[PDB]
Design a binder for this molecule. Structure first.
Ligand SMILES: CC(C)[C@H](C(=O)O)[C@@H](O)C(=O)O
Ligand SMILES: CC(C)[C@H](C(=O)O)[C@@H](O)C(=O)O
Ligand SMILES: [Ca+2]
Ligand SMILES: [Ca+2]
Ligand SMILES: [Cl-]
Ligand SMILES: [Cl-]
Lengths: 364, 364
């Protein structure tokens, strides 16, 4: 029946790429007969300007009344001299994850055929391609562990954060990783620092416990310092990477940057009900905002992840994905995906959204 | 007068590259009139085989009686199924750092002229070159913070580690970073996660306090997830990177792997007295051990760092560095530094050590 989406476009290019995601969604709604209602709420920088804080009470409550959050990007110059701890990005994202128990972050990243040369990797390495799904635990570990704070003064003033994980928190993120590997290349690489951290000793232990239910999936463990090196040499050997909160933050962004094409990358953060927050992997790109230059594909693929994971509409989600593939192989590329001698073939944000939506309309 | 070095060659290629470092040191001792006595002690894997643990009491005591530790590499297949927490590398390295208060880790990494093509970076990026010094805080933060451990059972069993930093611990590592920038390109990039961690809020605060004493050095702050991406796009823009224990672990290894030439990279871990532990950046490479293939240059440059930082012998240290430069630009390269169509020009470990030592002898 009727789905309700909270739309939180945020700052920078958020609103302009959101417009294209909505246009594509409208074509999907028509093609598949879905009834989806959308309400927009302020978040991030615009919420600080309009309401005094990055996550107003009204926005939080509109997310509670929704089936999913279609989220843009938050932050920029204007607020980047507030304390790092009252800044819009951490002030929007961390309480949304904590409040809705969005323990699971999925970040699919691949080198697209024909775009290998944009990876900052050496040509013989990018030619091999890669397709790496990062599964990051999002509501535990050092981000929300207590005690957190500071005590004392002067030279002996100290600050502390506590990384904490229970077996239950580890096993539920690990099962997601194994379940995902099962449908891909059947390998989970679990990433920890078990030679140093008590949380990582438990992590590796519990991942090995969960593994018994997946005898068809290969499991390997790697230290985070070694994983950050190995992704530079053989990223084609990884399938699913399984990580705790802080190691996942670092590793998923390293992998994204390895694609050289962040404008194509989206992100799902979900709870066990399948309520989630769907966002592009990259930032608010405030210098390009309002110019029709931003690549909307990341925000469009966010909507496809939303349709799949929160709304259980697998066909709708894959239609959008294929409309994106069709754009990428039919010469519909924005300026950041072109070598600068070809930068004159660039499509605008609106041209991309129009093409993608017409492709869904035409039955792609 | 007479210096005393504890030699802890460890496992794998440790002993064979150590032999070359000692040969080079002998030439430096003759050229500069230094009296250096060396005693060897077991550490790591060989210590587990010979003494039941990775850091025997006799080894610890021989390090206490020395002016510096010239350290090889620990670990390998044979011990890699003990608990990650009784393994040789963490079992040797963490108690040595804690016992001697080796708070400062320096890892100099550069792309050497002529070896750019070995970097896993895209050719236009490696052509630009880079020279990045990582300064990592080594005895604080989450590695040695308490409470650390676990409690409970079953699903609610939990583990915890505590990241802790005081202003005094931050200011002494930061002054090292600023002092080092002052002699290089005069920029410190401090790396934290101040949007999430109480330790990082204090970190960034205190680094800004220390900065007042260095008005000639530029200071910028970057989040660790952003630093791991940016090193892939503009590593030539960084000079000194300043990091806490866990972020430094990750970032220094990412930078090392970016050079594509780990066999050239060394590491200094020092206390405030200038006692230190000097080691190659890479591992024990157990599959190549005993074959004369390993590149000894990392271990030779460890000895130069030892001469400079612990023994206050700047001239001796720079003679070794220049002997290494001469090798690299005179066709003296080991097999891993050659493109495989040139792998027939490879020098052995002994040929490299002989060349480098003769270069010091000849007055390089
Ligand atoms: C804004 C910050 C708290 C956040 C994180 O650390 O999770 C961001 O880096 C991300 O990856 O979503
Ligand atoms: C062995 C391990 C504890 C160690 C570290 O985390 O410091 C190693 O990764 C290093 O960089 O020296
Ligand atoms: Ca991040
Ligand atoms: Ca390391
Ligand atoms: Cl964590
Ligand atoms: Cl730390």
């Amino acid at each position: 029946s009727s789905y309700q989406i909270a739309v939180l476009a945020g700052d920078g290019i958020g609103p302009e790429v959101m417009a294209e995601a909505r246009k594509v969604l409208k074509a999907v709604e028509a093609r598949f007969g879905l009834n989806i209602e959308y309400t927009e709420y302020d978040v991030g920088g615009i919420a600080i300007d309009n309401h005094g804080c990055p996550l107003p009470e009204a926005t939080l409550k509109g997310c509670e009344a929704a089936d999913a959050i279609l989220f843009g990007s938050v932050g920029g110059p204007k607020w980047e001299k507030l304390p790092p701890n009252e800044q819009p990005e951490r002030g929007a994202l961390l309480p949304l994850r904590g409040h809705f128990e969005l323990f699971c972050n999925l970040r699919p990243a691949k080198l697209h055929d024909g775009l290998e040369h944009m990876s900052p990797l050496r040509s013989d390495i990018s030619a091999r391609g890669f397709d790496v799904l990062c599964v990051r635990e999002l509501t535990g570990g050092i981000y929300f562990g207590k005690p957190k704070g500071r005590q004392g003064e002067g030279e002996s003033e100290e600050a502390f954060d506590t990384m904490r994980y229970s077996r239950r928190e580890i096993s539920r993120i690990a099962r997601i990783a194994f379940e995902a590997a099962r449908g891909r290349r059947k390998k989970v690489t679990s990433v920890d620092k078990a030679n140093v951290l008590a949380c990582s000793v438990l992590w590796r232990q519990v991942v090995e416990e969960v593994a018994v239910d997946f005898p068809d999936v290969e499991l390997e463990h790697i230290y985070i310092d070694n994983a950050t090196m190995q992704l530079l040499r053989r990223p084609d050997e990884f399938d699913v990477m399984l990580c705790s909160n802080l190691f996942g933050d670092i590793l998923s962004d390293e992998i994204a940057m390895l694609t050289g094409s962040m404008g194509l990358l989206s992100s799902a953060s979900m709870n066990s009900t399948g309520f989630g927050l769907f966002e592009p992997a990259g930032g608010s790109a405030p210098d390009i905002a309002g110019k029709g230059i931003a690549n909307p594909i990341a925000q469009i693929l966010s909507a496809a992840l939303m349709l799949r994971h929160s709304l259980k509409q697998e066909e709708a989600a894959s239609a959008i994905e294929r409309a994106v593939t069709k754009a990428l192989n039919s010469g519909y590329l924005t300026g950041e995906l072109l070598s600068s001698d070809q930068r004159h073939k660039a499509k605008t944000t609106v041209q991309m959204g129009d093409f993608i939506a017409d492709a869904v309309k035409a039955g792609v």
